[PDB]
């Protein structure tokens, strides 16, 4: 039994609960149940593995999950996405620092409470759906099968406060013929630590994050697969997910001409980069110095909608423009305090655009037992 509670500006109060049983009723299968609850998300999975199935280091794992997503509580245009599915994954260990994975996934997405907006309705139209633009009471259910691929390079010298090496994670999925949706999606994450001194007290850190996806054969990528930027983990100094396209709402009518907004919706393309200088903490050269890390950083990122038609909506910003790079700068503090790991940051978004929401003070604190 492992439990975890946390509080942060990105996800409010976070609860986690898990149980893992290596051998379930002498079957040899390792079974695990896990749960997560956010301000905006409720997630539950059933994990299955079996080390007696592993062949030449290639392992097989199963997953059965449920997910409840409330987009309004993630600072996005309001909608609800209740989903469930399964995943079967294979793990290939290439070497001591590189692993691969490939699996098949099924997912049922049940959408509701969609607040009519242009970009959202653009995807819906491409799927043959024609729900009213004057009401939030709506529904769209789909069933998809996917092929999932992943690569992880991890050569970081230490887990908690790395000082040398890099970590790269590349993931990709595509819909299989027969699915309701028709799209692909790629994500890339990189972290690189370079120590300048022998004691590794001074370290340069470069982070990047990329995402691109689009529909296939006339379709569009569903909006619930969008990428986001802005927040404690992406571009500090900005409110969570604020970076990128903003919703253009249709007018609401009672049961019997568009509106600009500052509500983010994400996009199908995304680019984020950060440079961070890790330094010693001033005047704490005692035993507590090893558990505290101070840093100065420069963050930037952009999100855009490749299928945004600026011609039909000339009165509104061009949300297909990839060149609206947002930037911020500030200082971060990391502490392995008694109450768990803590991260505090203060950043000033010196380059922002219309609709961006600032959040200079951001912090996350967790605790697991």
């Amino acid at each position, epitope marked *: 039994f492992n439990f975890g509670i946390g509080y942060g500006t990105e996800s409010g109060v976070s609860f986690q609960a898990g149980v893992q049983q290596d051998n379930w009723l002498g079957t040899g299968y390792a079974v695990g149940i896990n749960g997560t609850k956010n301000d905006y998300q409720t997630y539950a999975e059933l994990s299955v593995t079996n080390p007696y199935f592993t062949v030449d280091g290639v392992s097989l794992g199963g997953r059965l999950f449920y997910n409840d997503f409330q987009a309004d509580d993630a600072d996005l245009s309001d909608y609800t996405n209740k989903s469930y599915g399964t995943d079967v994954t294979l793990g290939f260990p290439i070497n001591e620092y590189n692993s691969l994975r490939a699996g098949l996934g099924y997912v049922h997405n049940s959408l509701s409470n969609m*607040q009519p907006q242009v970009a959202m309705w653009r995807y819906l139209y491409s799927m043959g759906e024609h729900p009213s633009t004057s009401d939030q009471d709506n529904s769209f259910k789909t069933d998809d099968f996917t092929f999932n691929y992943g690569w992880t390079y991890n050569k970081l010298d230490r887990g908690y406060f790395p000082t040398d090496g890099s970590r790269v994670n590349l993931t990709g999925k595509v819909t299989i013929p027969g699915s309701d949706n028709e799209y692909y999606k790629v994500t890339l994450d990189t972290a690189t630590y370079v120590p300048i001194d022998d004691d590794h007290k001074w370290v340069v850190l470069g982070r990047t994050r990329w995402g691109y996806g689009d529909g296939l054969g006339g379709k569009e990528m569903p909006f619930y697969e969008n990428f986001y930027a802005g927040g404690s983990s992406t571009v500090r100094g900005f409110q969570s997910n604020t970076i990128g396209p903003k919703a253009v709402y249709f007018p609401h009518q009672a049961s019997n001409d568009l509106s600009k*907004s*500052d509500d983010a919706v994400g996009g199908n393309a995304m680019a984020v980069a950060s440079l961070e200088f890790i330094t010693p903490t001033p005047f704490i050269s005692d035993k507590y110095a090893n558990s505290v890390r101070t840093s100065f950083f420069w963050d930037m990122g952009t999100v855009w909608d490749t299928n945004w038609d600026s011609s039909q909506y000339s009165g509104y910003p061009d949300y297909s423009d990839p060149s609206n790079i947002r930037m911020s700068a500030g200082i971060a503090l990391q502490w392995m305090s008694p109450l768990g790991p803590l991260v505090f940051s203060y950043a000033q978004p010196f380059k922002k655009y219309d609709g961006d*929401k600032a959040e200079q003070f951001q912090f996350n604190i967790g605790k697991t037992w």
Partner: nanobody, 121 residues
């Protein structure tokens, strides 16, 4: 808790100003909205103001006649009701939300008790 005030009875054409406040609370980090329930009917969206406060959204029937706003300190939420019609007769409810705005009542987290507005021919 949310408390509405400013209702009553007015002849068609008149004006009203509804007010909503919460003791010791502010609307700083909240999306706020007004709903109304005409007799025999369901709660329907009237107007809303974004968390940022820079954007306002109205139902078509009241667009151009009603105005939702907040005071500088964000202690009070207002609905200016001009050019009243008989169909505007309803119990008006104040609502608040932590996330982005919506038009469905069940998407809002906190509600007032309602204040009655009657417009006579």
């Amino acid at each position: 808790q949310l408390v509405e005030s400013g209702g009553g009875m007015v002849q068609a054409g008149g004006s009203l100003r509804l007010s909503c406040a919460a003791s010791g609370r502010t609307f700083n980090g909240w999306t706020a909205a007004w709903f109304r329930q005409a007799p025999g009917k369901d709660r329907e969206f009237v107007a809303a103001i974004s968390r940022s406060g820079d954007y306002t959204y109205y139902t078509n029937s009241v667009k151009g006649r009603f105005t939702i706003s907040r005071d500088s300190a964000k202690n009070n939420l207002y609905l200016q009701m001009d050019s009243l019609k008989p169909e505007d007769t309803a119990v008006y409810y104040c609502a608040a939300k932590t996330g982005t705005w919506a038009t469905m009542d069940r998407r809002y987290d906190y509600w007032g008790q309602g204040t009655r507005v009657t417009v006579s021919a």
